[PDB]
Amino acid sequence: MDFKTVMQELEALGKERTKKIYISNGAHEPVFGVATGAMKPIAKKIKLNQELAEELYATGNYDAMYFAGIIADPKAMSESDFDRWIDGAYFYMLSDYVVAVTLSESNIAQDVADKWIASGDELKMSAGWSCYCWLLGNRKDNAFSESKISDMLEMVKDTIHHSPERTKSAMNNFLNTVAISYVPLHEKAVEIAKEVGIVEVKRDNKKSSLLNASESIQKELDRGRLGFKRKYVRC
Amino acid sequence: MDFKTVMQELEALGKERTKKIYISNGAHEPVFGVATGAMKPIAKKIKLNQELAEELYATGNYDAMYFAGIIADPKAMSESDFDRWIDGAYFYMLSDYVVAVTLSESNIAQDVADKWIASGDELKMSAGWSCYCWLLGNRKDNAFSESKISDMLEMVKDTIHHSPERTKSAMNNFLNTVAISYVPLHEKAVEIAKEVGIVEVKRDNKKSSLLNASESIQKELDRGRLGFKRKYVRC
């Protein structure tokens, strides 16, 4: 399995309806429209290869870029590498579900995430908040500072409604994840979600997403998932 | 590990925050309030033990009962054994997340689930519909007859709004799961959900839940989860 065969199989796996959805979300050609679950068999056959990942990411093809994140070697990627990737994440599916998930598995996750949240750039900030969501699922609470997370909750409470569209989404995912995956602040997260209320994420040529963190949190509790931690399911 | 050791360790893991929520969901004493993640290393040491599972299930303690499901041997459990268990499942967390999940790993899942769905008993039916949701995420489509699943979708449309509260919740989960995990009927499921509209699940001591299968299915599609099959995570 190399670049050639991967690009060929990915294309074969694509479908028109999944393709229209991605494009609907902000993706642009080239794109095949591959459902994530279909990549598991290919992933299984490829050992982390940063060279291959780079090549795939460089195609500018969303599906290939998504797959690149799966087979990347995050422990070998430097801050510089991540800035190259994030600079190529043209829409949220890339910044939140690809770059941020990969970063969450590096040794510099929090440092990069933090500079990105402070960058003032919508997608970079979105990837940053997103990274924290994945981190809270990958690591024990003991790997984080309670006061830091707590100050982040307050920042979200005071600024989510005025943040860039994509950033609001990531920030809302942060509220949910802290409430469910970082129990030390469960009560506060619930309290702030109630204070935040409905968060609207405006989208191009489609109904905006009306996010309800309080509701989401409550649904997770109904499923008995308080304290539930798990890595992001990539495929 | 023996019964006594397992019960000690479970109690040692109990925490008030978790317990409070379980009781809020419907559990009653005796209950410790154990986070499922912490049961993983314990179950790993036990693997399968039906005798221990039975002893644990008979305690009437939610956590012990939940753990019993994890270490059970569903391939050795008969239809009568499953009926004993469902008779002890006093609330949805037991019927849907314990009995239904264990059943989904047996060789008689569908026959039993079908009997339960037709039983007319709120919790047995809830377990039946839940079982199918778990089956759809842990098995290839070749395991399900399209004609049969399609009839089940019709049955949901014509009976969900008048169904017992917990059955309604499980039926709504069926709609969502078929739409995403069983592609042969993705359009049909999407259609049935549109016709069904908002599903309300009442629950004393709390404001009724207003389920919107159409939107949920849409959020999954947006992320590229069409055809995605996720095996139920017990711990």
Automatic annotation (TrEMBL), chains A, B:
Protein name: DNA alkylation repair protein
Naturally occurring in which organism (per UniProt): Bacillus cereus (strain ATCC 14579 / DSM 31 / CCUG 7414 / JCM 2152 / NBRC 15305 / NCIMB 9373 / NCTC 2599 / NRRL B-3711)
Residue ranges the record marks as coiled coil: none
Name of one Pfam family that matches: DNA_alkylation
